[PDB]
Amino acid sequence: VVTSNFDASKIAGEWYSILLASDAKENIEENGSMRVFVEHIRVLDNSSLAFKFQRKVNGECTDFYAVCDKVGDGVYTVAYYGENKFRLLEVNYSDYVILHLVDVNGDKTFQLMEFYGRKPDVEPKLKDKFVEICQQYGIIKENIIDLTKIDRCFQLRG
Numbered sequence: 001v002v003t004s005n006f007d008a009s010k011i012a013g014e015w016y017s018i019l020l021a022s023d024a025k026e027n028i029e030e031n032g033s034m035r036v037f038v039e040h041i042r043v044l045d046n047s048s049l050a051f052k053f054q055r056k057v058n059g060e061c062t063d064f065y066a067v068c069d070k071v072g073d074g075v076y077t078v079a080y081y082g083e084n085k086f087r088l089l090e091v092n093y094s095d096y097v098i099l100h101l102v103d104v105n106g107d108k109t110f111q112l113m114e115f116y117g118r119k120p121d122v123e124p125k126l127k128d129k130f131v132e133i134c135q136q137y138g139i140i141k142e143n144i145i146d147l148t149k150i151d152r153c154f155q156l157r158g
Contacts, residue, residue: 028145037055051066
């Protein structure tokens with residue numbers, strides 16, 4: 001695990017969305033804007049990270065792109081359904097990543113925790129590792145979704 005300062009060439013590549021939590025479960029539910037399934041991360045020449053992910057819109061699996069600009073060591077900013085600012089808490093370039101994001105629209109804000117894996121699934125130990133981390137941020141256990149149990153739009157990948 002790399003808690004402190006990271007690299008980026010080593011976070012690039014293909015990832016799978018595994019767990020997703022939000023103190024506003026409304027955003028990550030079917031039809032939720034933040035119900036994304038990440039695919040690949042590319043580090044651009046300007047140090048920004050180009051994210052490619054799928055979400056199911058109107059019953060159809062969709063492709064989305066977003067460039068996140070570096071604002072801090074391990075921190076980025078993205079415009080998507082508002083202004084987003086997320087921080088990478090833990091990164092094992094080989095296995096997974098867990099990040100914290102906050103979305104803002106005017107005076108309305110909400111929280112989001114994500115767990116990506118180099119593979120489609122991780123061991124049920126990290127699962128709990130994530131639950132704990134959410135517990136301590138205000139994201140109730142009933143607000144944590146396991147994406148492996150639903151359609152993660154794999155056809156679009158590649």
